[PDB]
């Protein structure tokens, strides 16, 4: 954020003069990551069981 | 000097025929001499009387 302060009023001393400030922005990122299993089982298994 | 056969070349074409490239499959003997049962699982049990 900026910050204002209060001018004072002199064409001479420190204040007087309207202090300058900035504002700024940051990057935040998604990245895309994969997460993955394999399962391997035998075809006869899958046929002998009496459930799917 | 003559013409032999070997002359002529692949001006002489060799032919085919596809009446020897035949085979009559034979199936098991065990599958038409005995009962088929259909199994659903690998073990089925099967309970005889032994003494």
Same mark, same amino acid.
């Given at each position: 954020?900026?910050?204002?302060?209060?001018?004072?009023?002199?064409?001479?001393?420190?204040?007087?003069?309207?202090?300058?400030?900035?504002?700024?922005?940051?990057?935040?990122?998604?990245?895309?990551?994969?997460?993955?299993?394999?399962?391997?089982?035998?075809?006869?298994?899958?046929?002998?069981?009496?459930?799917? | 000097?003559?013409?032999?056969?070997?002359?002529?070349?692949? %001006?002489?074409?060799? #032919?085919?025929?596809?009446? %020897?490239l035949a085979a009559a499959k034979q199936g098991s003997t065990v599958?038409?001499?005995?009962?088929?049962?259909?199994? #659903?699982?690998?073990?089925?049990?099967?309970?005889? %009387?032994?003494?």
């Amino acid at each position: 954020l900026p910050e204002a302060d209060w001018v004072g009023e002199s064409a001479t001393d420190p204040e007087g003069v309207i202090k300058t400030s900035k504002v700024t922005w940051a990057n935040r990122t998604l990245v895309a990551e994969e997460v993955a299993v394999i399962i391997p089982v035998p075809e006869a298994v899958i046929d002998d069981a009496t459930v799917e | 000097a003559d013409i032999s056969r070997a002359e002529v070349a692949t %001006l002489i074409e060799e #032919g085919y025929s596809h009446s %020897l490239l035949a085979a009559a499959k034979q199936g098991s003997t065990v599958l038409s001499a005995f009962q088929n049962v259909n199994m #659903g699982t690998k073990t089925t049990h099967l309970p005889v %009387l032994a003494t």
